[PDB]
């Protein structure tokens, strides 16, 4: 209706809503029972769901209520596709589909709004993982003429009827909770002077696309460190074949993808290196590195504890899916040394993205050091406000908050984020905690931080 | 946006919201603790508040989303002003202001939508009780030419700035939760081919008015049973003087209102009957019926247990405020026998309005008989659906529901109302109750009903 009118509308939905969740919090941090914990669980779920409908609806409304103002910055696109693929990776693997990204050429470093751009790709990507039962999802980006970039999310789902393709970018249009995820993309599009559309074919799949005039910051520096070298993919999955190919050729390699351990060999150069999907495992997890060939197994993070058996069988190494082009390159260049992927490093988890609020650089260092040793990707900020700045703009799985930090108190920094809408869990560090909770903080940790404390938290808030 | 789109929007806000409240219910019907009951209380409050913002916002939206269709019926206007005054009576008396209604002449029985008309008067009345700190509120209605009726809600509040008087009937316009109560009245107005407006004067008060072309069903039959008789009002309150006057003259009496026990006497006929407000009580509740005069004390329901001392002092009787013109007339005609007002009948409460769902007419009779003996005004319906019909259209304080009733199961009748938005508490009667609660029922009662059970419920859900 108006922006002033909405700013207080939000306060009035949110305030009682945070009220509910603060209460649910406190309750569960008190001895309860069968049923009497049954209830406080099923309440925090109904509450959490409603909060995401409310943020969705207010997000939508605040985007048609003013101009919007972008905070333009240099972003690494390959790094962005990867972050999104890696956030979606858990949803996809638990339905038994694949998520992967590739670029065909090096693209430029770009001047865009990282957070808003990511929001578009998450909307397309989530949709894709929700709607496909069969192959998987491919994130793609390619430069076009006019200083323009074009992002693709392709999926082996059931596709979109030809005439239904205008409909679905409108508010509260569904398949038959909000039905706003695309409406929100339609309005971030126009704010970047972009367009968005959809293709594919009914019953084969859907491609969702975004095409935005952008500012370049950089020469797409063109280092091809796989010049010469040859690489075979054996995977029965279409997405791992397509993406893994393009990732090779982006590093200046030649790629032979095959459905089969036996086909790969059949049509690939003899000096070629063999990438083999563990989806080809026969009974007992039988996977034979074909006699007298350099071979790398492609595992999902869950398949991590197979890595020892498959190195004894004579695989020279492993890659984790979705494939990082950087770790891909490091492994092929063992046609002759790289660190263990952070996603199987965890003592429990896969790689939780973590925001660290600590103002002492050296205490941050020691926290970061135990964090990255349970596979966490960690961002650090000095004070309680440029935390808020970076806990909206950001996307993260946990938030570690100092309390006696200057700028803003830990407690009023929590409160601030909880009242701003964002739902990410928050653990406090220090050496009067019942207000902490109700204020909107989920856990407490004894500072200085410790291996075994940090594990508890990683297992509790990342699964 | 659309009505189809809104019908599922509502489902999606409501469903998780009922989820929260079902859970809050179950929790509180299990042994808890200091804090661990502290929490389940403060949750059911934050939830209940949010539900009323949601119903408000969906109500508003569903009124601009279609035509609306009125269910026209014969309504008694004097009976309607009274019902509203009596619903507002508790809010007003606990801030120490007065609510009263009068008509000047008998009006016709009218063909209107009772529920929607009431909703307008509640919106105006609530506002009035919320915004006045000083005198009180007067509900008024008078016939005009064109078959038109005009309703007034006047208040000794701080009034409305002359130019602010268009503004305030718009959505999300405030004083500086929703700010929708008048927006909703603006759209029920237009649906009755009415107009609505406001008058008064800054810092003296505000009159809120509704003027609707209507259908007449009846001759305003003109029985004046106080022809001849004279009546003096002594009250320091402006509203009780104004309303109490007009109520006399509507029955064809002559009225002399005075601020004072001593002024009344000073200028009233000697044969006149004296109505004296207990707000004139001096210390210890001293109130002298002036020697050798027929006098009736006007009490608020809380002042009920003073009725014995004041009959010994020589008052011939009492009226409860806000004054019922019917009980007024019955008392004056003791210039020479009426039942005890239902509002001080309660063993605990004042008069809870109660909806009774029972299909056996004779079991309804026995329930009604204990109900009306704790001051309840009771409506009865045969089955679980024309309950829904009459628990929206209606306004009530408790709902007594049979379970093994034909038409609709008690449980799916609850569920139906809880999903329709309405918040009124619901107690079930019979001889597997944990689903009852979560389904949206608040209490259980052993059928057949009993004095002491019914008291519990009246004290728990009416205060
Ligand atoms: N990859 C896809 N394949 C097929 N249908 C899709 C795909 N992505 C989106 N849709 C359809 O597009 C509609 C609108 O999508 P969207 O606005 O994201 O709503 P939602 O995902 O249904 N609800 P919300 O969770 O708020 O995002 C969905 O209801 C689907 O009907
Ligand atoms: N009797 C009154 N005296 C003075 N101001 C009033 C009165 N009634 C209404 N108002 C003003 O009118 C505004 C709009 O009223 P309304 O739409 O009822 O919103 P609300 O009462 O503020 N919020 P809501 O509870 O949804 O009704 C209020 O915010 C007050 O500013
Ligand atoms: Mg979606
Ligand atoms: Mg109001």
PDB file of N, CA and C and ligand atoms in Angstrom, chain B residues 56 123-124 127-128 130-131 155 158-160 168 170 173-175 177-183 206 208, ligand 2:
ATOM      1  N   UNK B  56      -8.097  -9.738  10.862  1.00  0.00           N
ATOM      2  CA  UNK B  56      -8.441  -8.333  10.549  1.00  0.00           C
ATOM      3  C   UNK B  56      -8.053  -8.134   9.098  1.00  0.00           C
ATOM      4  N   UNK B 123     -17.012  -1.558  16.009  1.00  0.00           N
ATOM      5  CA  UNK B 123     -15.760  -0.883  15.609  1.00  0.00           C
ATOM      6  C   UNK B 123     -15.803   0.523  16.205  1.00  0.00           C
ATOM      7  N   UNK B 124     -16.898   1.235  16.057  1.00  0.00           N
ATOM      8  CA  UNK B 124     -17.044   2.617  16.576  1.00  0.00           C
ATOM      9  C   UNK B 124     -16.946   2.653  18.098  1.00  0.00           C
ATOM     10  N   UNK B 127     -13.494   1.715  19.605  1.00  0.00           N
ATOM     11  CA  UNK B 127     -12.624   2.895  19.388  1.00  0.00           C
ATOM     12  C   UNK B 127     -12.917   3.866  20.536  1.00  0.00           C
ATOM     13  N   UNK B 128     -14.193   4.152  20.753  1.00  0.00           N
ATOM     14  CA  UNK B 128     -14.684   5.166  21.701  1.00  0.00           C
ATOM     15  C   UNK B 128     -14.190   4.794  23.093  1.00  0.00           C
ATOM     16  N   UNK B 130     -11.736   2.860  23.862  1.00  0.00           N
ATOM     17  CA  UNK B 130     -10.257   2.867  23.888  1.00  0.00           C
ATOM     18  C   UNK B 130      -9.821   4.320  24.051  1.00  0.00           C
ATOM     19  N   UNK B 131     -10.429   5.258  23.331  1.00  0.00           N
ATOM     20  CA  UNK B 131      -9.895   6.638  23.231  1.00  0.00           C
ATOM     21  C   UNK B 131     -10.412   7.594  24.322  1.00  0.00           C
ATOM     22  N   UNK B 155     -18.655  10.199  22.326  1.00  0.00           N
ATOM     23  CA  UNK B 155     -17.655   9.882  23.366  1.00  0.00           C
ATOM     24  C   UNK B 155     -17.079  11.196  23.866  1.00  0.00           C
ATOM     25  N   UNK B 158     -10.847  12.873  23.283  1.00  0.00           N
ATOM     26  CA  UNK B 158     -10.076  14.058  22.911  1.00  0.00           C
ATOM     27  C   UNK B 158     -10.433  14.572  21.512  1.00  0.00           C
ATOM     28  N   UNK B 159     -11.363  13.888  20.837  1.00  0.00           N
ATOM     29  CA  UNK B 159     -11.973  14.306  19.564  1.00  0.00           C
ATOM     30  C   UNK B 159     -11.006  14.127  18.419  1.00  0.00           C
ATOM     31  N   UNK B 160     -11.418  14.499  17.199  1.00  0.00           N
ATOM     32  CA  UNK B 160     -10.638  14.329  15.928  1.00  0.00           C
ATOM     33  C   UNK B 160     -10.428  15.697  15.268  1.00  0.00           C
ATOM     34  N   UNK B 168      -8.722   9.034   8.428  1.00  0.00           N
ATOM     35  CA  UNK B 168      -8.743   7.915   9.416  1.00  0.00           C
ATOM     36  C   UNK B 168      -9.606   6.713   8.952  1.00  0.00           C
ATOM     37  N   UNK B 170      -9.229   5.168   6.171  1.00  0.00           N
ATOM     38  CA  UNK B 170      -8.351   4.483   5.184  1.00  0.00           C
ATOM     39  C   UNK B 170      -7.551   3.392   5.913  1.00  0.00           C
ATOM     40  N   UNK B 173      -3.932   3.651   8.586  1.00  0.00           N
ATOM     41  CA  UNK B 173      -3.825   5.041   9.131  1.00  0.00           C
ATOM     42  C   UNK B 173      -4.208   5.019  10.627  1.00  0.00           C
ATOM     43  N   UNK B 174      -3.357   5.643  11.475  1.00  0.00           N
ATOM     44  CA  UNK B 174      -3.146   5.384  12.938  1.00  0.00           C
ATOM     45  C   UNK B 174      -3.245   6.708  13.747  1.00  0.00           C
ATOM     46  N   UNK B 175      -2.665   6.782  14.973  1.00  0.00           N
ATOM     47  CA  UNK B 175      -2.509   8.017  15.826  1.00  0.00           C
ATOM     48  C   UNK B 175      -1.028   8.249  16.167  1.00  0.00           C
ATOM     49  N   UNK B 177      -3.729  -2.139  16.223  1.00  0.00           N
ATOM     50  CA  UNK B 177      -2.375  -2.344  15.673  1.00  0.00           C
ATOM     51  C   UNK B 177      -2.395  -2.242  14.158  1.00  0.00           C
ATOM     52  N   UNK B 178      -3.304  -2.985  13.539  1.00  0.00           N
ATOM     53  CA  UNK B 178      -3.523  -2.998  12.076  1.00  0.00           C
ATOM     54  C   UNK B 178      -3.846  -1.574  11.630  1.00  0.00           C
ATOM     55  N   UNK B 179      -4.728  -0.909  12.386  1.00  0.00           N
ATOM     56  CA  UNK B 179      -5.378   0.338  11.965  1.00  0.00           C
ATOM     57  C   UNK B 179      -6.343   0.050  10.826  1.00  0.00           C
ATOM     58  N   UNK B 180      -7.184  -0.976  11.009  1.00  0.00           N
ATOM     59  CA  UNK B 180      -8.145  -1.418   9.968  1.00  0.00           C
ATOM     60  C   UNK B 180      -9.597  -1.272  10.424  1.00  0.00           C
ATOM     61  N   UNK B 181      -9.868  -1.153  11.704  1.00  0.00           N
ATOM     62  CA  UNK B 181     -11.249  -1.171  12.222  1.00  0.00           C
ATOM     63  C   UNK B 181     -12.192  -0.211  11.497  1.00  0.00           C
ATOM     64  N   UNK B 182     -11.765   1.013  11.218  1.00  0.00           N
ATOM     65  CA  UNK B 182     -12.586   1.958  10.432  1.00  0.00           C
ATOM     66  C   UNK B 182     -12.548   1.584   8.954  1.00  0.00           C
ATOM     67  N   UNK B 183     -11.400   1.212   8.382  1.00  0.00           N
ATOM     68  CA  UNK B 183     -11.356   0.769   6.956  1.00  0.00           C
ATOM     69  C   UNK B 183     -12.451  -0.278   6.711  1.00  0.00           C
ATOM     70  N   UNK B 206     -16.054  13.265  20.164  1.00  0.00           N
ATOM     71  CA  UNK B 206     -16.172  12.745  18.793  1.00  0.00           C
ATOM     72  C   UNK B 206     -17.507  12.041  18.714  1.00  0.00           C
ATOM     73  N   UNK B 208     -19.282   9.400  16.042  1.00  0.00           N
ATOM     74  CA  UNK B 208     -19.088   8.549  14.855  1.00  0.00           C
ATOM     75  C   UNK B 208     -20.474   8.147  14.365  1.00  0.00           C
TER      76      UNK B 208
HETATM   77  N1  LIG C   2     -13.441   7.902  19.111  1.00  0.00           N
HETATM   78  C1  LIG C   2     -12.267   8.267  18.597  1.00  0.00           C
HETATM   79  N2  LIG C   2     -11.651   9.371  19.076  1.00  0.00           N
HETATM   80  C2  LIG C   2     -10.474   9.751  18.566  1.00  0.00           C
HETATM   81  N3  LIG C   2      -9.776   9.178  17.593  1.00  0.00           N
HETATM   82  C3  LIG C   2     -10.421   8.104  17.120  1.00  0.00           C
HETATM   83  C4  LIG C   2     -11.624   7.594  17.554  1.00  0.00           C
HETATM   84  N4  LIG C   2     -11.978   6.487  16.809  1.00  0.00           N
HETATM   85  C5  LIG C   2     -11.000   6.359  15.932  1.00  0.00           C
HETATM   86  N5  LIG C   2     -10.005   7.294  16.107  1.00  0.00           N
HETATM   87  C6  LIG C   2      -8.802   7.451  15.334  1.00  0.00           C
HETATM   88  O1  LIG C   2      -9.035   6.773  14.124  1.00  0.00           O
HETATM   89  C7  LIG C   2      -7.888   5.946  13.768  1.00  0.00           C
HETATM   90  C8  LIG C   2      -8.278   4.766  12.910  1.00  0.00           C
HETATM   91  O2  LIG C   2      -9.103   3.942  13.715  1.00  0.00           O
HETATM   92  P1  LIG C   2      -9.233   2.406  13.454  1.00  0.00           P
HETATM   93  O3  LIG C   2      -9.236   2.159  11.982  1.00  0.00           O
HETATM   94  O4  LIG C   2     -10.267   1.857  14.412  1.00  0.00           O
HETATM   95  O5  LIG C   2      -7.727   1.951  13.877  1.00  0.00           O
HETATM   96  P2  LIG C   2      -7.246   1.465  15.348  1.00  0.00           P
HETATM   97  O6  LIG C   2      -8.556   1.483  16.234  1.00  0.00           O
HETATM   98  O7  LIG C   2      -6.185   2.525  15.522  1.00  0.00           O
HETATM   99  N6  LIG C   2      -6.646   0.040  14.895  1.00  0.00           N
HETATM  100  P3  LIG C   2      -7.601  -1.215  14.838  1.00  0.00           P
HETATM  101  O8  LIG C   2      -7.614  -1.804  16.213  1.00  0.00           O
HETATM  102  O9  LIG C   2      -7.452  -2.250  13.762  1.00  0.00           O
HETATM  103  O10 LIG C   2      -9.055  -0.762  14.961  1.00  0.00           O
HETATM  104  C9  LIG C   2      -7.329   5.560  15.130  1.00  0.00           C
HETATM  105  O11 LIG C   2      -5.973   5.246  14.849  1.00  0.00           O
HETATM  106  C10 LIG C   2      -7.505   6.868  15.890  1.00  0.00           C
HETATM  107  O12 LIG C   2      -6.360   7.571  15.466  1.00  0.00           O
END
